[PDB]
Design a protein around this ligand. Structure first.
Ligand SMILES: [NH3+][C@H]1CCc2c(Br)ccc(Br)c2CC1(O)O
Ligand SMILES: [Cl-]
Ligand SMILES: [Zn+2]
Length: 891
């Protein structure tokens, strides 16, 4: 029965905070925070008490207009809210001031002000500023910030906060201070401070239009300063992209990026002072796997793009979160697609959406991208809000085209720059462009708003007709969203369907690609002068976030896979072929299990599909990244969206059969390709250059490592020789793959020790090594996890360490879901232990339970018993309690 906030209840504050003047004085065993708030009474004031958020603060004194308030008589504080009785609240402009004590050195929850190794750092989104000092801690309370930080100079030579550094000064006793002025009004969740012995790389950027000089700095601890350069390159690329595509320039004289080792999320867009999980900022080619480079490009870009979509235009309230996150992910997706120029970039986003986000949207946690209520906002930084939000933001571009999309985006910025905004404000701007494109001032996007308010994944299904004498082709389309616990009645959405038509005789396009606008529950689209029966290429680029039911034969899907122009449709046609096979074999194994059959049949894999995989693999002009997708079955969390009461044992048996069906025909091709790809995949050009990344070459290594895994599982003759040579590669992607694939051989623990020694002296590489062990397909994985706990992880409270040890293992379909329930018990024990010092990470660790009600009856009960046991833990966090109550349909 928690405190629940509702979107419909929004109302402006009765107060105004115009300026914030902070003095943050860091000592070994306490930090003293002095704060002066220059305040006023708003037009919405009705004489209410003045209530500040303030969580876990120790009050030394509080004052109004430099007269101390008296506890009990004039205020009360209950460790969450400071209430000043209205009788003592002025009726015009006044100053509120306070001095509180906080303890970053024991703040293991990494919210508010905390210590990460030898760095002091803040994290204030969403509602952490109230853990530093008193505030009306909501994003519509925008103010200007004057921040002084003081500390021991030897321990903390670098002091940072938002904006211009206006003074530096020495203090008796070996201390010093620095003062910052941020001229841009901001909500308090964008405040940040950093103190540490930081080293940096720097550059000067000159903006495109106003020719402003901007100093760019990237910071880390001294040991890792050599890992800063790619992030700086990524920042320069991000700034140029926002200038080139959106015409947006940076608006301060300096921008700082800072890496810290202990961080709950990827990074944070604090104004002029972006703070990063080190794993999302630091890399070097000797000490990072390839995937670090796309991760840093993404996160550095994302944080930079927030400078407009989030900071200069911010949020009226937290229900609008997708307005900054969906939009900023979309901006980062456009950026990364342009930077990498690989079709796999878009494909990876689709692969993530249709696995983890579709799972979420059919789970008890399902919510629209603009939720209707919350208890802890930190539980709603979800793949729905971010990734479905991004697809909803991308649909605007698909509908409008680039020219009118840019026009609408510029309207959004112009109308809302410097202010809070709502999702409706964005839709309104897009609507102005829509009216232009349609040349119709009665056109509107009112229906489009359902994408913000309606939960659940739409299902879009197709039927076809071709009249050869008339040369007339028809596509009959239906949409359906399943009722859920948010709406028992669902409405049709505005679904853009990018389509082409392929001539199956020559593989050629038969129409100009066109985007069909489905706005009704069903529609028929007719095409004339279609000279022969086509195969339709549907939802090109994955043009709407939906379940696609193409009702094509496997023969037609093979032709698309081979000849279509659109990477997504080729990949999806392959996905659909696999799913048809998976569901068939799954049912065959399931019946044999349920009926305790002594003999039964399995349906073999389609031989023409196997031939098509071989054809694409052997094509020297086809794309290595795309090839790695075609030889992999769909993700387990994708598959589960199509199976009721999923028995994970039967699914594992199903995958095993299909992979071996294909390998028994293609392993020699796999081996030949693994060998022929080596020269180009592993070429050492630019290995000593952190300013250039070859994303195509990286995709060649991904393909090689995918093929090696398939060949190792298959026990291909003498493949251990290749694994051992692979362990000698300079590329960590390769030598960590050699550990993974050696799980099937007696050399596993030899390579475990070899790669440990290669990893143990770099904090981030060791975490990648932990992930590799955790995900190893070992029969003794439970004993290996104990080894990691006892020898490596031990008592670490570092979120990266804990997540590395446990989350990859939870994707071990056969072992995590052991029918004894021991894997559920193991992870629940970790969740409960972690919740006592880091509620956010504890809730992140709950991820495997999200599919609990989609599993077979026995596993459902096992998972539910562990969740209810977690709910019984004394002093459970609000974060974890809310999450588990919602997930078990109690909230
Ligand atoms: N505002 C920050 C919130 C933290 C977070 C989370 Br949670 C998930 C993905 C990303 Br990317 C981020 C970075 C961010 O800038 O959105
Ligand atoms: Cl000063
Ligand atoms: Zn973000």
């Amino acid at each position: 029965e928690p405190k629940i906030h509702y979107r419909k209840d929004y109302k402006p504050s009765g107060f105004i905070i115009n300026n914030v003047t902070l003095n943050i004085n860091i000592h070994d065993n306490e930090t003293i925070v002095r704060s002066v708030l220059d305040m006023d009474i708003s037009k919405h004031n009705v004489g209410e008490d003045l209530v500040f958020d303030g969580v876990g603060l120790k009050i030394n004194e509080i004052s109004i207009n430099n007269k101390k308030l008296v506890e009990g008589e004039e205020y009360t504080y209950d460790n969450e809210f400071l209430t000043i009785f209205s009788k003592f609240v002025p009726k015009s402009k006044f100053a509120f001031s306070s001095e509180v004590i906080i303890h970053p050195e024991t703040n293991y929850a990494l919210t508010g002000l905390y210590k990460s190794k030898n760095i002091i750092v803040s994290q204030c989104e969403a509602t952490g500023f109230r853990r530093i000092t008193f505030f009306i801690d909501r994003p519509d309370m925008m103010a200007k910030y004057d921040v002084t930080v003081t500390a021991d100079k030897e321990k903390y030579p670098v002091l940072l906060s938002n904006g211009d550094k206006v003074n530096e000064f020495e203090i008796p006793g070996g201390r010093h201070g620095a003062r910052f002025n941020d001229p841009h009004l901001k909500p308090c969740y964008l405040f940040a401070v950093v103190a540490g012995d930081l080293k940096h790389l720097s550059a000067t950027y000159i903006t495109k239009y106003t020719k402003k000089k901007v100093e760019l700095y990237v910071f880390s601890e001294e040991k890792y300063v050599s890992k800063l350069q790619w992030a700086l390159e990524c920042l320069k690329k991000s700034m140029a992209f926002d200038e080139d595509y959106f015409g947006l320039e940076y608006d301060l004289s300096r921008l700082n990026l800072v890496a810290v080792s202990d961080f709950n999320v990827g990074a944070m867009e604090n104004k002029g002072l972006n703070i990063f999980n080190a794993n999302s900022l630091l890399a070097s080619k000797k000490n990072s796997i390839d995937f670090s480079y796309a991760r840093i490009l993404t996160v550095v870009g994302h944080e930079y793009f927030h400078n407009y979509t989030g900071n200069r235009v911010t949020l009226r309230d937290w229900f609008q979160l997708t307005l900054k996150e969906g939009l900023t992910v979309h901006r980062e997706n456009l950026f990364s697609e342009e930077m990498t120029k690989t079709v796999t970039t878009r494909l990876s986003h689709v692969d993530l959406l249709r696995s983890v986000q579709f799972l979420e949207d059919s789970s008890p946690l399902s919510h629209p991208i603009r939720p209707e209520s919350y208890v802890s906002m930190e539980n709603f930084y979800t793949t729905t809000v971010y990734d479905k939000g991004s697809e909803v933001m991308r649909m605007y571009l698909t509908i409008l085209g680039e020219e009118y999309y840019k026009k609408g985006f510029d309207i959004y910025i112009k109308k809302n720059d410097g202010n809070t905004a709502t999702c409706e404000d964005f839709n309104y701007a897009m609507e102005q462009a829509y009216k232009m494109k349609k040349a119709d001032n009665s056109a509107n996007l009112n229906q489009y708003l359902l994408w913000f308010s309606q939960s659940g994944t739409p299902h879009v299904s197709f039927k076809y007709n071709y009249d050869a004498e008339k040369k007339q082709y028809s596509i009959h389309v239906n949409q359906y969203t399943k009722p859920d616990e948010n709406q028992k009645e669902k409405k049709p959405l505005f679904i853009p369907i990018s389509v082409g038509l392929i001539n199956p005789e020559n593989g050629k396009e038969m129409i100009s690609q066109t985007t069909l606008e489905l706005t009704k529950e069903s529609d028929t689209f007719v095409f004339n002068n279609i000279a022969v029966k086509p195969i339709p290429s549907l939802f090109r680029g994955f043009s709407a976030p939906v379940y696609i039911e193409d009702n094509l034969t496997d023969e037609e899907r093979i032709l698309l896979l081979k000849y279509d122009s659109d990477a997504f449709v080729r990949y999806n046609s392959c996905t659909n072929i696999y799913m048809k096979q998976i569901l068939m074999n799954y049912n065959e194994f399931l019946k044999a299990k349920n009926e305790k059959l002594e003999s039964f049949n399995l349906t073999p894999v389609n031989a023409q599909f196997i031939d098509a995989i071989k054809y694409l693999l052997e094509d020297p002009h086809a794309d290595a990244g795309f090839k790695s997708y075609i030889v992999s079955l769909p993700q387990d969390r994708y598959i589960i969206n199509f199976v009721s009461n999923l028995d994970t044992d039967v699914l594992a048996d199903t995958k095993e059969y299909i992979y071996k069906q294909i390998g028994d025909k293609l392993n020699d091709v796999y081996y030949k390709m693994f060998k022929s790809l080596e020269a180009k995949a592993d070429d050492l050009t630019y290995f000593n250059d952190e300013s250039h990344v070859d994303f195509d070459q990286m995709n060649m290594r991904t393909l090689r490592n995918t093929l090696l895994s398939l060949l190792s599982k298959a026990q291909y003759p003498n493949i251990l020789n290749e694994i051992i040579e692979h362990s000698k590669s300079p590329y960590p992607s390769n030598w960590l793959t050699s550990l993974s694939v050696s799980a099937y051989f007696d050399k596993y623990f030899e390579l475990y020790d070899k790669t440990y020694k290669l990893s143990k002296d770099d904090e981030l590489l060791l975490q990648e090594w932990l992930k590799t062990v955790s995900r190893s397909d070992r029969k003794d994985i439970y004993e290996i996890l104990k080894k990691l706990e006892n020898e490596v992880l031990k008592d670490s409270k570092n979120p990266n360490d804990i997540r590395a040890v446990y989350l990859p293992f939870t994707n071990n379909l056969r072992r995590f879901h052991d029918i004894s329930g021991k894997g559920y018990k193991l992870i629940a024990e970790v969740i409960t232990k972690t919740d006592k010092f880091n509620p956010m990470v504890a809730t992140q660790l709950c991820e495997p339970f999200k599919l609990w009600n989609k599993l077979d009856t026995k596993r459902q009960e096992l998972m539910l018993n562990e969740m209810n046991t977690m709910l019984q833990e004394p002093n459970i966090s609000n974060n974890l309690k809310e999450y588990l109550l919602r997930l078990t349909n109690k909230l």
